[PDB]
Amino acid sequence: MMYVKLISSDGHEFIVKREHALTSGTIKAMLSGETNEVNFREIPSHVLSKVCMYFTYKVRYTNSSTEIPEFPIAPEIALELLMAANFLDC
Amino acid sequence: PVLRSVNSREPSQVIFCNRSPRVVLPVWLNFDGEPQPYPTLPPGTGRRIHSYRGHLWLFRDAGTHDGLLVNQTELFVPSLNVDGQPIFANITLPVYTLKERCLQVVRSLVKPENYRRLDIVRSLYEDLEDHPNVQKDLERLTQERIA
Amino acid sequence: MDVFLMIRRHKTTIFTDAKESSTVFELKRIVEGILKRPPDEQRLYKDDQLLDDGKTLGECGFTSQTARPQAPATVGLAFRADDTFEALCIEPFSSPPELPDVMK
Ligand SMILES: Cc1ncsc1-c1ccc(CNC(=O)[C@@H]2C[C@@H](O)CN2C(=O)[C@@H](NC(=O)C2(F)CC2)C(C)(C)SC[C@H]2CC[C@H](CN3CCOCC3)CC2)cc1
């Protein structure tokens, strides 16, 4: 499908399907007032990587009667991930 | 209260199946609408129990009070048994928002007093504080029904 | 049986879903559209071993349980430019801070 690129502070590039990224209203807006790229100056890769995994998880298991697994969040990343979440509104 | 059980006095048999990784606390709304606790179901367990038609159930994490879904909705009302078959109420994890899930993990690791010590924006303290509860979800469901 | 995976090379990472009945070549084609490099120039690896074109994803070991949406499996990528295929180099993600004391 259509893909978009989400870049972290440490310079890692993540290519995610647009519809997966549009899970975040903040990413949506950034995408539209062209480049399909977005730069997150304050989100490091070990957070943004986990954000992309959430995008995959929500899409698959949203509106599905399969037993939903627990989204795994380790303790060492939880506080940073929460911060990213509040900003991304996902 | 619109969200209240009704005294059918008509017995129904249900199987509560926990299809979550969480310890479930079954919650029964009495005829005056008050939430009432019931025996907990550990993960991977199910039980055949007795209830009556028109009685309202909701299902929650026993320790954290996080919201859980019963048959892919929030409320379970036992139907009339058919052919001797128990009605199945399957408790599943919802697809939480990333923020809510992140809050669940932090709350799990940080004592409520120390929430203010975290180096996070203030709006998020208040969020960590607003622990999930049954009283708040009942008002939402009522208004949704009104809609 | 959809499998969910991460395709990584250097500092790039791709998040895509594929069927267990699909192959390396079909996945190399997926890389094409996204990254504009032809299949002849892509080597896809599971761990340190090359995955042979025409081996189904499950055969390669990308089992449905092993590659899950919450915890995707990594399929390595290296590009063949000019003379030699490059060595596999997947840069690590940032290291997390030390857990704060309150959490500790
Ligand atoms: C094992 C397990 N694991 C997770 S949950 C669970 C579990 C466990 C027990 C159940 C019993 N079931 C109900 O309590 C259903 C449910 C709800 O529908 C209300 N309710 C009613 O019984 C209401 N009464 C009435 O509606 C009427 F009289 C009009 C018909 C009522 C709440 C007003 S009386 C409840 C009494 C409780 C005591 C019992 C007698 N003993 C045996 C149990 O303890 C000791 C003494 C007789 C009934 C169900 C599930």
XYZ file of C-alpha atoms and ligand atoms in Angstrom:
391
model
C 0.000 0.000 0.000
C 1.078 3.563 0.557
C 3.985 3.867 2.957
C 5.362 6.685 5.111
C 8.648 7.263 6.883
C 8.993 8.047 10.558
C 12.452 9.126 11.744
C 13.737 9.154 15.318
C 16.098 11.511 17.132
C 19.024 9.088 16.766
C 18.361 8.939 13.018
C 16.675 5.558 12.619
C 14.200 5.442 9.726
C 10.990 3.409 10.039
C 8.813 2.734 7.021
C 5.246 2.127 7.952
C 2.069 1.846 6.041
C 0.305 5.102 5.973
C -2.840 3.724 7.407
C -0.843 2.316 10.283
C 0.752 5.712 10.939
C -2.592 7.508 10.640
C -3.455 5.746 13.908
C -1.946 8.919 15.423
C -3.777 12.187 14.854
C -0.501 14.016 15.440
C 1.216 12.047 12.665
C -1.741 12.654 10.420
C -1.471 16.353 10.764
C 2.228 16.368 10.316
C 1.673 14.467 7.134
C -0.788 17.115 5.848
C -0.675 20.875 6.497
C 4.431 15.990 -0.138
C 7.253 14.414 1.677
C 5.772 11.376 3.261
C 8.479 11.719 5.888
C 8.152 12.900 9.497
C 11.007 13.742 11.880
C 10.611 13.273 15.644
C 13.343 15.275 17.362
C 12.410 14.077 20.869
C 11.505 10.407 20.258
C 14.465 7.978 20.305
C 14.503 4.811 18.237
C 13.872 2.462 21.169
C 10.572 4.316 21.678
C 9.548 4.942 18.070
C 10.281 1.311 17.214
C 7.773 0.316 19.895
C 5.279 2.878 18.572
C 5.364 1.266 15.126
C 4.759 -2.125 16.738
C 1.669 -0.672 18.407
C 0.447 0.512 15.004
C 0.736 -3.064 13.722
C -1.000 -4.456 16.816
C -3.958 -2.057 16.838
C -4.725 -2.550 13.140
C -4.663 -6.358 13.186
C -6.530 -6.852 16.469
C -8.982 -3.943 16.136
C -12.430 -5.259 15.171
C -11.298 -8.881 15.460
C -12.800 -11.688 17.538
C -9.431 -13.415 17.911
C -8.152 -13.540 21.472
C -6.220 -10.287 21.898
C -2.655 -10.671 23.227
C -1.274 -8.225 25.773
C 0.817 -5.436 24.323
C 4.208 -5.843 25.826
C 5.815 -2.753 27.378
C 9.000 -3.133 29.307
C 9.659 -1.092 32.333
C 12.773 0.595 31.109
C 10.948 2.213 28.160
C 7.521 2.765 29.730
C 7.939 6.385 30.831
C 9.393 7.482 27.487
C 6.701 5.552 25.604
C 3.959 7.215 27.661
C 5.438 10.612 26.804
C 5.520 9.740 23.103
C 1.958 8.412 23.331
C 0.543 11.590 24.879
C 2.207 13.582 22.093
C 1.065 11.260 19.290
C -2.486 10.904 20.693
C -2.451 7.187 19.863
C -30.853 4.021 37.085
C -31.038 2.914 33.445
C -28.019 0.647 34.027
C -29.544 -1.635 36.628
C -30.399 -5.268 36.841
C -34.009 -6.292 36.854
C -35.558 -8.871 39.112
C -36.578 -11.398 36.555
C -36.396 -14.223 39.028
C -35.937 -16.179 35.823
C -32.853 -18.314 36.217
C -30.089 -18.367 33.594
C -26.909 -20.316 33.465
C -23.771 -18.772 32.161
C -20.226 -19.804 31.672
C -17.770 -17.090 32.355
C -14.663 -17.808 30.355
C -11.559 -15.729 30.839
C -9.766 -15.364 27.626
C -7.543 -12.652 28.984
C -4.074 -12.810 30.552
C -5.570 -10.829 33.445
C -7.184 -11.846 36.723
C -10.853 -11.004 36.177
C -13.180 -9.613 38.831
C -16.833 -10.182 37.825
C -18.979 -7.177 38.735
C -22.750 -7.434 39.151
C -24.997 -4.365 39.164
C -27.747 -4.785 41.741
C -31.339 -3.737 41.113
C -30.535 -0.339 42.648
C -27.636 -0.006 40.186
C -24.804 -0.464 42.688
C -21.700 -2.383 41.537
C -21.186 -5.580 43.529
C -18.007 -7.710 43.534
C -17.990 -11.444 42.839
C -15.402 -14.266 42.975
C -12.317 -13.727 40.836
C -11.384 -15.877 37.837
C -7.641 -16.442 37.255
C -6.274 -16.362 33.696
C -7.125 -19.367 31.566
C -10.107 -20.425 33.686
C -13.862 -20.661 33.278
C -16.788 -21.361 35.573
C -20.455 -22.308 35.236
C -22.483 -19.964 37.336
C -26.012 -19.031 38.140
C -27.580 -15.731 37.363
C -30.938 -14.541 36.188
C -32.205 -12.862 33.045
C -31.948 -9.141 32.748
C -29.117 -8.948 35.285
C -26.226 -6.737 34.180
C -22.573 -7.791 34.381
C -19.289 -6.030 33.674
C -15.801 -7.507 33.929
C -12.578 -5.954 35.178
C -8.984 -6.631 36.144
C -9.094 -7.629 39.805
C -5.990 -5.713 40.875
C -5.886 -2.673 38.599
C -9.620 -2.279 37.774
C -8.721 -1.886 34.090
C -11.715 -2.315 31.808
C -12.286 -5.625 30.036
C -14.745 -6.689 27.344
C -17.348 -9.455 27.596
C -18.307 -10.865 24.184
C -16.670 -7.842 22.520
C -18.842 -5.330 24.412
C -18.618 -3.765 27.863
C -21.846 -5.124 29.392
C -23.212 -8.670 29.579
C -26.900 -9.406 30.136
C -27.731 -13.138 30.426
C -30.212 -14.289 27.795
C -32.740 -17.118 28.024
C -30.964 -20.473 27.884
C -31.865 -22.526 24.807
C -31.707 -26.331 24.612
C -29.995 -26.655 27.991
C -27.047 -24.672 26.699
C -25.236 -22.308 29.010
C -24.710 -18.795 27.768
C -21.073 -18.063 27.234
C -19.527 -14.820 28.447
C -16.039 -14.494 27.115
C -13.758 -12.004 28.755
C -11.175 -10.598 26.423
C -8.511 -7.938 26.672
C -9.553 -4.755 24.844
C -7.273 -3.049 22.343
C -6.176 -0.248 24.651
C -4.796 3.034 23.412
C -1.016 3.170 23.668
C -1.317 5.944 26.259
C -3.716 3.986 28.470
C -1.520 0.884 28.244
C 1.579 2.933 29.070
C -0.263 4.346 32.087
C -1.159 0.804 33.191
C 2.498 -0.254 33.239
C 3.730 2.887 35.001
C 0.992 2.709 37.633
C 1.999 -0.930 38.111
C 5.600 0.095 38.844
C 5.208 3.492 40.573
C 3.388 3.972 43.860
C 0.595 6.576 43.643
C 2.398 8.941 46.021
C 5.479 9.063 43.777
C 3.588 9.927 40.570
C 4.616 13.565 41.039
C 8.246 12.629 41.235
C 8.300 11.415 37.649
C 9.878 13.741 35.139
C 6.822 14.081 33.068
C 4.433 16.832 32.127
C 1.742 17.676 34.637
C -1.122 16.697 32.487
C 0.221 13.154 32.699
C 0.300 13.077 36.516
C -3.445 13.757 36.527
C -3.782 10.953 34.030
C -1.924 8.469 36.111
C -4.089 9.549 39.035
C -7.335 9.009 37.189
C -7.294 5.329 37.821
C -9.782 3.328 35.973
C -12.938 2.679 37.986
C -16.432 1.302 37.526
C -18.321 4.418 38.653
C -16.980 6.501 35.757
C -17.649 3.889 33.067
C -21.263 3.480 34.206
C -22.037 7.152 33.550
C -20.501 7.001 30.071
C -22.501 3.905 29.118
C -25.713 5.558 30.328
C -25.085 8.647 28.192
C -24.203 6.490 25.178
C -27.527 4.690 25.631
C -29.288 8.055 25.910
C -27.679 8.876 22.557
C -1.726 -17.210 8.178
C -0.345 -13.667 8.143
C 3.116 -13.173 9.654
C 4.278 -9.740 10.847
C 7.934 -8.812 10.470
C 10.542 -6.053 10.519
C 12.943 -5.764 7.572
C 16.067 -3.918 8.686
C 19.310 -2.721 7.113
C 21.685 -0.200 8.513
C 19.463 2.430 10.151
C 16.388 1.581 8.087
C 13.475 -0.536 9.322
C 10.332 -1.606 7.452
C 7.178 -2.876 9.062
C 5.098 -5.186 6.894
C 2.722 -8.131 6.937
C 3.170 -11.178 4.745
C 1.525 -14.601 4.455
C 3.194 -17.686 5.787
C 2.619 -19.275 2.361
C 4.603 -16.506 0.628
C 8.307 -16.679 -0.233
C 11.570 -14.779 0.070
C 11.249 -13.638 -3.542
C 7.732 -12.288 -3.012
C 9.073 -10.443 0.038
C 12.077 -9.181 -1.930
C 9.505 -7.808 -4.375
C 7.812 -6.062 -1.441
C 11.170 -4.421 -0.707
C 11.319 -3.227 -4.282
C 8.324 -1.055 -4.241
C 9.215 0.401 -0.928
C 12.926 0.840 -1.315
C 13.439 1.034 -5.070
C 16.058 -1.669 -5.357
C 15.555 -4.699 -7.590
C 15.331 -8.264 -6.236
C 18.652 -9.195 -7.855
C 20.328 -6.756 -5.438
C 18.667 -7.911 -2.233
C 19.731 -10.680 0.140
C 17.310 -11.415 2.873
C 18.503 -13.132 6.034
C 17.124 -14.787 9.093
C 19.743 -14.263 11.683
C 23.053 -14.725 9.895
C 21.941 -17.122 7.177
C 20.667 -16.234 3.735
C 17.136 -17.117 2.908
C 16.866 -18.825 -0.387
C 14.455 -17.369 -2.884
C 11.466 -19.678 -3.119
C 11.373 -20.864 0.499
C 8.048 -20.140 2.169
C 8.116 -17.796 5.136
C 7.148 -20.538 7.546
C 9.919 -22.747 6.208
C 12.338 -19.959 6.849
C 11.149 -20.115 10.389
C 9.065 -17.051 10.435
C 6.309 -18.902 12.192
C 3.032 -17.176 13.009
C 3.830 -17.294 16.681
C 7.392 -16.284 16.208
C 6.410 -13.180 14.210
C 3.660 -11.405 15.910
C 2.284 -8.026 15.497
C 3.368 -6.804 18.989
C 6.724 -8.462 18.667
C 7.705 -8.610 15.043
C 10.467 -10.757 13.676
C 13.432 -9.324 12.052
C 14.271 -10.138 8.433
C 17.657 -8.783 7.594
C 18.538 -6.856 4.439
C 21.721 -5.975 2.668
C 21.965 -4.322 -0.687
C 24.059 -5.373 -3.612
C 25.610 -2.314 -5.163
C 28.080 -2.551 -7.972
C 30.809 -5.124 -7.279
C 29.850 -6.841 -4.061
C 26.896 -7.550 -1.917
C 27.425 -5.632 1.296
C 27.944 -7.225 4.685
C 24.887 -7.472 6.893
C 24.841 -4.535 9.253
C 21.713 -3.824 11.314
C 22.389 -0.879 13.597
C 20.971 -1.308 17.115
C 18.204 0.805 18.550
C 19.012 3.446 21.148
C 19.733 2.135 24.620
C 17.057 2.961 27.222
C 17.867 5.122 30.255
C 18.392 3.592 33.657
C 15.169 2.864 35.309
C 14.292 5.658 37.539
C 14.456 4.947 41.273
C 10.814 5.290 42.011
C 10.134 2.584 39.511
C 13.071 0.513 40.700
C -18.210 -19.218 41.414
C -17.988 -17.856 40.750
N -16.723 -17.443 40.136
C -16.828 -16.161 39.620
S -18.314 -15.580 39.882
C -18.956 -16.819 40.642
C -20.409 -16.872 41.152
C -20.681 -17.188 42.473
C -21.999 -17.230 42.919
C -23.046 -16.954 42.046
C -24.494 -17.011 42.573
N -25.398 -16.269 41.684
C -25.918 -14.945 42.038
O -25.625 -14.437 43.055
C -26.770 -14.301 41.135
C -25.932 -13.440 40.096
C -26.673 -12.392 39.873
O -27.661 -12.683 38.891
C -27.445 -12.082 41.302
N -27.701 -13.270 41.843
C -28.697 -13.576 42.894
O -28.823 -14.681 43.282
C -29.569 -12.472 43.467
N -30.854 -13.054 43.724
C -31.877 -13.061 42.663
O -31.634 -12.588 41.611
C -33.265 -13.694 42.914
F -33.570 -14.204 44.139
C -34.435 -13.115 42.117
C -33.842 -14.469 41.731
C -28.977 -11.972 44.782
C -27.575 -11.387 44.520
C -29.902 -10.883 45.356
S -28.899 -13.399 45.933
C -27.203 -14.102 45.922
C -27.138 -15.289 46.901
C -25.677 -15.549 47.234
C -25.556 -16.750 48.176
C -26.174 -18.003 47.563
C -26.181 -19.172 48.588
N -25.013 -19.576 48.940
C -24.155 -20.014 47.950
C -23.074 -18.981 47.588
O -22.545 -18.306 48.675
C -22.933 -18.793 49.915
C -24.449 -18.985 50.055
C -27.623 -17.749 47.144
C -27.762 -16.512 46.243
C -22.772 -16.644 40.718
C -21.457 -16.604 40.276
